[PDB]
Subunit: 245 residues, 6 copies
């Protein structure tokens, strides 16, 4: 009845599997999850250069989703790359996982702490806090100091580091909830919530619920003004397939 395209903005199939599993686990009856990733791009997003590439990969999948007539989209990287670009191209609502996780956090706690993977991505999360208006609601931001793909390397080291950092955050930061800062951390939320007795929030699952909510409310992206469909123009070279509508 409801079809939601969950887009992993990086090209890692391993991370797409983790994201897809988290999305399906919370999906309402009648909801089909279409877990996808770009055909071309970057295996993991670890900075501004990676984000710019990922943004176009998102748009390629948004185009595919709109052609399929999906009800909504999820951008499944914690930088929410190409969010507003995607909202212009898509008819159905587009929700970022950082956006969704932060939104949910303010509903269950006064302040939250972010636990992400790489230190150099903290600035990206800081920018999003300011952009979304949740800076005052964020007590602290932390990184476990590992490459993004360490969450998929099977060692369990990244997962243990997340757990330890969450425990330390709840003791030190003066926050009531944890926002997981990675699509690769998606399947950790439930176990950490049960273990630590506080909301540990995965943006993937949260974004799925936001799309479902908006669809049930009969609400989609405003095509009045800022997020209207892109102005009609000829796209050249590698970009010519992005807007056939």
């Amino acid at each position: 009845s409801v079809r939601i395209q969950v887009i992993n903005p990086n090209t890692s199939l391993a991370m797409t599997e983790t994201i897809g599993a988290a999305a399906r686990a919370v999906a309402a009856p009648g909801t089909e999850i279409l877990a996808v990733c770009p055909r071309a791009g970057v295996p993991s997003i670890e900075g501004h250069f990676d984000e710019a590439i990922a943004a176009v990969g998102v748009l390629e999948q948004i185009r595919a989703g709109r052609e399929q007539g999906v009800d909504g989209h999820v951008i499944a990287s914690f930088g929410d790359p190409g969010l507003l670009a995607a909202r212009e191209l898509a008819q159905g609502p587009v929700i970022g996982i950082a956006e969704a996780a932060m939104h949910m956090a303010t509903m269950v706690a006064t302040r939250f702490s972010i636990v992400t993977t790489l230190p150099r991505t903290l600035i990206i999360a800081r920018h999003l806090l300011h952009q979304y208006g949740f800076h005052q609601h964020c007590a602290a931001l932390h990184a476990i100091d590992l490459p993004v793909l360490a969450l998929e390397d099977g060692s369990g080291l990244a997962q243990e580091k997340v757990r330890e950092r969450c425990i330390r955050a709840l003791k030190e930061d003066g926050s009531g909830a944890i926002v997981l800062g990675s699509g690769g951390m998606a399947t950790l939320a439930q176990q950490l919530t049960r273990e630590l007795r506080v909301p540990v929030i995965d943006g993937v699952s949260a974004a799925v619920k936001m799309v479902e909510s908006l669809v049930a409310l009969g609400l989609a992206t405003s095509k009045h003004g800022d997020l209207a469909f892109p102005e009609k123009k000829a796209l050249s070279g590698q970009f010519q397939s992005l807007n056939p509508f």
Copy 2:
């Protein structure tokens, strides 16, 4: 399967009916709506004095809801009176309608305009924008300059004034969506959305979807720190029934 207590913070049964109808219209399969209002309080909330009274009325119903073992609560007045107080008392999540409407607005538009009823309540909405962190996302705030209960007087004047103000807001404000600033405007959202071809958002319906989402995510109010259950103490006089837990 899921029971959500939707609390009208004012004592108007007429407004409770409007709020209850909007909540049931969007409720997911398996969701039961318990539309309630305080036994004692104020017929409509039109200022800070009214809000303080309404806040205690909310708590009385929160207590009743928790005794019944409901899955979540909705505070159905645009000032979200007693929101954090309710989150302390309740186990299940508590979502305000102003909170929910503003949250939804940022997901479908870059900026939104608020249309409320009385001018003196604009300051309350301004304070909430700052508190929730959506001040930059709000292009303008407007009032139709009628008493709150004019929405329930059967004349249709308030409803027409809302429509006209929404049209003018979309032309002048530089916004892409409308946030309805009253529980009494709840049943107007769908018709105005279809008519104006932009998201016109009712917080009542939005808050219901937020509660459903949080319950499906296995998330509830953090009892770690700020929103923990109230400290054990003896309440005197009229307040003695508020915390029997």
Copy 3:
């Protein structure tokens, strides 16, 4: 000549005595202090639930004060519960102790540190800093980690903890003054100011001086717009005695 109603929002007579003593100690010649507390409510305010109850208790006393024809009111809890509600109901000015202490602090120092009692009340103080616009003027917020009523238990432990925390704040925070974050700390200000050679500010005494100042200036709460007397309506049950005017 000038009568000021100093309202302890909690029901502790012990704290009312401390607050009353601090108010009378600085009162100008011709000023009578009416130290009161609600007939029904909470013994101490330690969270949002407690604040909501205290707010209505304040209003009950505001009503009594206005009937007596007092020149002004003081809300003597560091959360300033029901401040704007009280300003609507009262004719004479209403000053919160957090408000007054913060206002005074900016007049004698570039930045101040707050020392309150319970950790879970720090968020309430943070919210007030943002609401009043003094966030940039506050270097740090601290709690001594004891129940509010520990200040009245006769052990002197809370008083010693305040002193030690003030010393540590002045060494570490980069602030020039201390704002005491409790009505129960009211009588500590003078001794700590003399001992530490910096302004240690009690909001109770400060608020009394603000009321006296406004009365001498011939200024009272604006009844134009936002803080006008509450709209005429029937209050039901426990609330029916709040607005007989």
Copy 4:
């Protein structure tokens, strides 16, 4: 018993008379007002260049006041020139009239409007709003578009323009109080308050009450850190008389 030096930062004796009259009118029993102005400087302050000159003139009088052993000081220009410099040099508290008027405004209204004299001084008032943290509390800023000294030219034109602008501000701005943006407007506050039935606030009178309040509280400028007495050094030329202490 209490001696307060009220410093007009400009060299206009006419404005010093207006400022002195406003200060004495509200002074508590036992308070002596010492109305002064710099021996050298600028007849009126109408920009940043004028402010820089006025700041040094303030310091010259602060030095004189401290030599006389006055209990406190008032800086009686709406730009509060040399406020922090004065607080370093003086032992007793130093209160600016813009500072005091804005502080009082937030105690009697949710939002205020500023009415000053020259348009080019609006930016100075804007900067002070941000510095003091009252930007959100200011609904609008207006200028009557006349030279500062027009208030002293005997025509009554400036006074009528202030009145008309206050009436228009209360109708349009969505504010509950007026802050007078000139030391030359000081004696207009009472009449406008009575006429318009809202708080029309003069910073001169307000600052006097703030000094009296701080003295009665046993509070003075913190000499710990930022506002400590200036570091011991040799001042050359025209400045050699500024710090003989």
Copy 5:
């Protein structure tokens, strides 16, 4: 001696010519301007979708510039697309034209007004104001309500509309300078500055001077932390040529 790559992020050669002419007109002796545009992309940037495409086009040229060993780069669209991504990839400094124009404006005026082309791009300029921290320095933002490429259509209509809007801005906004909000407006700055007797600032010319300044200071992008070279990884498909270093 100094080679600066000035990148037009859109594919319009006409706009590249305008941008190149403005860059060469102010270039210091010894400075060579390399005016370029992407081989693939969008003819004009008129929204978030266009920006995402332009960002990758910028990166393609950044790669080419770094291979050539240029001293610095300029991103010549008013949305500064891919600015931080470019700073990661490039060794020499990368300056956006919106960034440079806003920076220059604060050095010659207290507040500035922005005049851009399309209304839907105003939100992009608003976001940059917040990101760069110049929101308080911007009095107003305006659009002439024409397509971006109207500046290159030879009619002179867009140019006249810019002039008229600048005149109206200086009369109404309370600003002292104009920031031109288009790379297509680059060659209008000098004539408008001379005509209106105020700074009318072109970001293209300003950014060139910023690059020259940084090179002369011996300063380049920090490779410590956030703007370090992208993490070593395999780029697939259309993106494989972006990082051969």
Copy 6:
């Protein structure tokens, strides 16, 4: 061809020499540096009192510079004393060294750390961060805890303390660049940049490049509104020589 007056706001000839050397080292071909200091004032600026004195000393030199017909001015103290006053008096652009250093820092790094000399001057730097709008771009502010003139005492202790503090800042703060917080640190920038492999920015050299840039762009201070020449009036006593124009 281009003459830039670089004003040391303090009276230390030793610091004037350091400032002058840094300015000449980066000056473009054809640029003459006029390194000056006030005839009367303070040997070093270490607080608000010192700043007020320095501001008038700056104006005395601005007057001299304008009489000589210089192309621009630099205010060479990290508090940028009398910046807006100087912009009113001068025809050519006036750039502060704190202003210039902060501006440059945002062009080469996401966030910067400030290293100044005396702790009591940190508040002045904090105020400038807010005024210029770079608060979010500043990760931390540090002082080496020595008198300002320790940089000129020949011991090399201050220079070593700056180096050590820069190393610690880059390890702890999460910043990519260092802003030197003293005119006395001007000649340290190049060596520290080469040693630490990050941008270590001197405001003196940066401000010189900003003046050169503005002159080449044909841009000067706006005389429309806020920064117009001071209103024509008689200056008395020591101030009578400040505005002979």
